[PDB]
Amino acid sequence: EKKFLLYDVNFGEGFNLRRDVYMRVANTVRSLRDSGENYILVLPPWGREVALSWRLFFDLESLNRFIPVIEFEDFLDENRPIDQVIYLQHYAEGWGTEYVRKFEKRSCLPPAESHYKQVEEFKWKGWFYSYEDVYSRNFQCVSIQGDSGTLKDLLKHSNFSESTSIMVDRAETILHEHYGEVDYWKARRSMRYSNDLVDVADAFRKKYLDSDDKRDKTKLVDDWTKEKPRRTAIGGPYLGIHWRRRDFLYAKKAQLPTIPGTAKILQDLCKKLDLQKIYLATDAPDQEVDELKALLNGELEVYRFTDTQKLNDGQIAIIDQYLCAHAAYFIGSYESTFTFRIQEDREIIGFPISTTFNRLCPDTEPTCEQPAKWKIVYSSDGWSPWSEWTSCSTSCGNGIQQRGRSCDSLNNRCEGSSVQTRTCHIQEC
Numbered sequence: 001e002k003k004f005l006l007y008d009v010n011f012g013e014g015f016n017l018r019r020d021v022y023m024r025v026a027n028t029v030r031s032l033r034d035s036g037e038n039y040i041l042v043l044p045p046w047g048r049e050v051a052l053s054w055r056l057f058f059d060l061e062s063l064n065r066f067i068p069v070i071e072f073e074d075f076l077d078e079n080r081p082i083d084q085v086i087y088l089q090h091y092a093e094g095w096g097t098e099y100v101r102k103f104e105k106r107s108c109l110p111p112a113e114s115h116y117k118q119v120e121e122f123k124w125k126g127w128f129y130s131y132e133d134v135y136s137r138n139f140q141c142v143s144i145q146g147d148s149g150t151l152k153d154l155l156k157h158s159n160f161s162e163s164t165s166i167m168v169d170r171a172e173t174i175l176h177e178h179y180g181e182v183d184y185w186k187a188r189r190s191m192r193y194s195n196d197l198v199d200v201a202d203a204f205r206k207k208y209l210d211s212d213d214k215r216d217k218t219k220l221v222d223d224w225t226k227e228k229p230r231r232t233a234i235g236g237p238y239l240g241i242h243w244r245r246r247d248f249l250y251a252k253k254a255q256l257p258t259i260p261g262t263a264k265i266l267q268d269l270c271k272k273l274d275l276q277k278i279y280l281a282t283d284a285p286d287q288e289v290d291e292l293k294a295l296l297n298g299e300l301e302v303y304r305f306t307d308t309q310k311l312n313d314g315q316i317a318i319i320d321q322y323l324c325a326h327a328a329y330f331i332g333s334y335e336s337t338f339t340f341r342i343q344e345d346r347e348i349i350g351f352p353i354s355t356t357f358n359r360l361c362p363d364t365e366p367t368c369e370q371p372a373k374w375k376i377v378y379s380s381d382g383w384s385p386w387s388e389w390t391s392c393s394t395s396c397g398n399g400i401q402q403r404g405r406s407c408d409s410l411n412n413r414c415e416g417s418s419v420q421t422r423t424c425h426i427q428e429c
């Protein structure tokens with residue numbers, strides 16, 4: 001008995017926050033399947049006016065090794081109705097002294113009812129990834145606190161037993177179960193980039209960066225399930241920088257360097273590491289990149305992927321990430337999920353952690369907070385130290401971060417909390 005899980009996320013969320021939510025939902029599907037449910041994940045079209053296949057960005061065969069996945073267009077070809085939408089929203093009273101995992105159907109909080117409308121008894125209209133003719137047979141809001149496992153529980157609740165296809169909107173509401181542990185990393189590891197994108201990126205490395213997998217020692221097994229831990233990747237003879245600006249300048253100024261600050265940082269790293277080539281991934285306008293270059297030493301060369309051909313903006317972004325990921329040394333931007341996904345690529349490729357978890361400091365704070373070191377994992381008073389805080393659950397609006405610790409109750413009292421939670425807010429949506 002096939003069942004289908006569809007999802008969407010807050011309209012304002014970017015590509016790389018959406019990549020993280022995929023992992024949350026993919027782990028819900030994993031749990032569902034481990035418990036005997038034949039669930040298939042339907043991949044949501046990439047949109048903000050467009051409705052683009054996952055193939056353009058990712059290797060489906062890789063994704064399919066973790067859980068069964070289909071494109072949304074394939075799902076439509078089966079002529080199956082969407083039986084139920086579950087919207088997903090917070091508990092209006094907010095979380096308490098413990099972060100209780102729970103869910104409950106509740107009246108819809110905004111903007112739910114401005115985004116879905118009952119036009120016939122079994123016809124609820126909504127965005128549905130820009131597809132005008134798609135609709136749901138049923139609709140409701142559910143307040144939820146919890147994780148991939150909690151979502152599993154919700155989807156198995158008797159209230160939805162008659163549905164075969166269910167769409168969970170505002171999926172960013174859900175947290176990772178076991179953040180940074182095996183299954184989190186299996187989901188991350190399965191998101192191999194599309195071969196065509198990897199080919200284009202490798203052509204650039206060869207032609208401009210004196211870089212290929214052979215010399216860089218960055219060759220990865222074709223089948224991600226066979227990856228093993230290593231810290232022996234060298235990378236091409238270049239420095240990678242993700243330079244996040246645009247909106248970050250107008251919601252995030254105090255923790256970013258200026259143009260001269262950035263120049264200084266790059267010059268210093270290049271001297272320390274004997275590198276003369278820099279790969280720059282940035283969203284900044286040409287002028288700003290031009291002013292950066294003009295502040296650098298004449299010996300240093302700055303490269304960017306700009307011969308983009310017929311490639312769409314998301315493909316270009318992936319290419320920038322892959323190129324940063326293969327540098328001898330990487331430095332990224334504060335709280336950017338585009339940067340977070342690069343750090344994860346480096347973990348997978350097998351670089352030393354020193355070369356990966358680095359962030360550009362603001363001009364007046366050279367000992368600024370550096371990113372949390374969530375390292376790749378392949379295997380599964382007496383309190384441990386607290387873990388790092390997780391990345392914010394949301395890239396815009398209010399979200400959640402947590403940190404955890406453990407204690408052996410058999411040989412110690414182990415009093416007090418093993419989890420802390422706090423609100424985070426990266427920028428406005």
Ligand SMILES: Nc1nc2c(ncn2[C@@H]2O[C@H](COP(=O)(O)OP(=O)(O)O)[C@@H](O)[C@H]2O)c(=O)[nH]1
Pocket residue numbers: 013014015016017018242243244281282283313316317318320335336337338339395
């Ligand atoms: N090509 C390219 N695009 C970028 C870069 N940095 C930001 N962007 C664009 O801006 C978006 C920012 O949203 P997201 O990926 O969620 O990352 P975040 O806002 O940095 O957390 C990215 O998806 C890209 O479309 C970059 O270095 N290269």
Ligand SMILES: *[C@@H]1O[C@H](CO)[C@@H](O)[C@H](O)[C@H]1NC(C)=O
Pocket residue numbers: 103104105142157159
């Ligand atoms: C299931 O549906 C009924 C309304 O028909 C509702 O009372 C109940 O709260 C729902 N259960 C959950 C756990 O959301």
